[PDB]
Write a protein that binds this ligand. Structure first.
Ligand SMILES: CC#CCN1C(=O)c2ccc(S(N)(=O)=O)cc2S1(=O)=O
Ligand SMILES: CC#CCN1C(=O)c2ccc(S(N)(=O)=O)cc2S1(=O)=O
Ligand SMILES: [Zn+2]
Ligand SMILES: [Zn+2]
Lengths: 251, 251
């Protein structure tokens, strides 16, 4: 399968035509204030410089392999451990966030993928409710160079070829995420690529994160995808809610 | 394991010493109104007389094994299928519900235990997020007699012995529950007997079900448990929320 260019995704993966798919369009005034949504807890994310982390070009995105010990909680006793993170982005002049807010698509989007501590392996967790949790944040253009993201973007050139990978030194993973861990949207959806497994809890931060133009450009323009072809516009059209009510941690 | 004496429940099952156990004390004052909680939807609960259902005195409760085909959804994409239902009660002039409201203990309580459609069987579901779900309703003393419960209560004589069972014709299982599926409390808890696995979603109706006084005597008076003792006060001690917030489908 490929981003923008058949095969159609149900042909390759019928799950992708399920009723509860991701990403989705967030319409904050139809979201539901749920006071029981407490602040996110992220421990162990402040990594030292060694060991090094694997950063690969998989042709569908750039992916950082996170080590054991990144622990996350959506609620009391509802804990997770981070596996990896990756990005989604547009092209020159065009946005490529997966999730949108009232129609507005953001320049790019970070996804940090976690596994319920109730499941030992990802493949037990796939398809099961709550088995996987993704923290999503939006990246926009702001006036300043973002130093947390620079640590990755400055390494993009070395893995421009589809399938190539490099070791980067450890970074503070939490530094790539927004400021208020108490302000987010949450719904249950799916993987946004095949196999499109449902049961994924999606937490989308209410706050954005700001990158320079040199940094967003670097993100879309540096990487080569499948075929003699650029890795760009690697997002999925927003999917219908089909009766799902998006929740908000804030009024 | 039993209610009143040894063995102690953590010595049986380690999970019975978990932080997030059931039952709890529902203080509506502190419940988070959550407008994403829509009305519950049952399917296939209106059973014909054949096939018949096994009703058992397992020495801890009276338990009705339910057939295939009984579908329940907590909301869009949160789908379960019913396994069994059972009862908790007190004694003469003593209440026996597991859950209490602002300290109030009700005469008895019906549990309807469900399995997430993501799991083929209970052992896969235990301890997993949302793996099992229980619908709980309180039974109160009422003026007129309940004809739905008379179908079951009239058969208790036949299973007085501990470990005995009978076969009863099918019935509207939903008529054993309140008519209002829209107004409820929801929280994440445990099973209230070993192995006491967490990750269980408890939905507690605020509408009660009404049984005549004799019916409540029939329930509490008829059955025999371990030793030469009646089966009575077969509820577990109220457990602390330990930071969990109960949600409410209504303001
Ligand atoms: C099979 C398998 C697997 C692992 N994953 C994916 O394919 C996939 C696709 C999209 C995402 S995304 N856009 O975060 O949901 C995450 C994953 S994954 O769990 O790491
Ligand atoms: C192992 C196994 C099993 C099945 N179940 C239990 O042990 C248990 C305990 C308490 C309840 S209760 N009192 O409703 O929580 C229900 C079940 S069960 O799922 O049918
Ligand atoms: Zn993604
Ligand atoms: Zn019970």
């Amino acid at each position: 399968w490929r981003y923008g260019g058949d095969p159609p995704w149900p042909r390759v993966s019928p799950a992708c035509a399920g009723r509860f798919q991701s990403p989705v369009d967030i319409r904050p005034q139809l979201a539901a204030f749920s006071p029981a949504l407490r602040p996110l807890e992220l421990l162990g994310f402040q990594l030292p410089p060694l060991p090094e982390l694997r950063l690969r070009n998989n042709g569908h995105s750039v992916q950082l392999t996170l080590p054991p010990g990144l622990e996350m909680a959506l609620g009391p006793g509802r804990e997770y451990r981070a596996l990896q993170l990756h990005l989604h982005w547009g092209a020159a002049g065009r946005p490529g966030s997966e999730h949108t807010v009232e129609g507005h698509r953001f320049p790019a989007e970070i996804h940090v993928v976690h596994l319920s501590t109730a499941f030992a392996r990802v493949d037990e967790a796939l398809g099961r409710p709550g088995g996987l949790a993704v923290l999503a944040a939006f990246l926009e253009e702001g006036p300043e160079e973002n130093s947390a993201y620079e640590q990755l973007l400055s390494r993009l050139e070395e893995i421009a070829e589809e399938g190539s990978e490099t070791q980067v030194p450890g970074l503070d993973i939490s530094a790539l995420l927004p400021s208020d861990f108490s302000r987010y949207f949450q719904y249950e959806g799916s993987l946004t690529t095949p196999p499109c497994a449902q049961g994924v809890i999606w937490t989308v931060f209410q706050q954005t994160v700001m990158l320079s133009a040199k940094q967003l450009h670097t993100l879309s323009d540096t990487l080569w995808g499948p075929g003699d072809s650029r890795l760009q516009l690697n997002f999925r059209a927003t999917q219908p809610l089909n009766g799902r009510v998006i929740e908000a941690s804030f009024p």
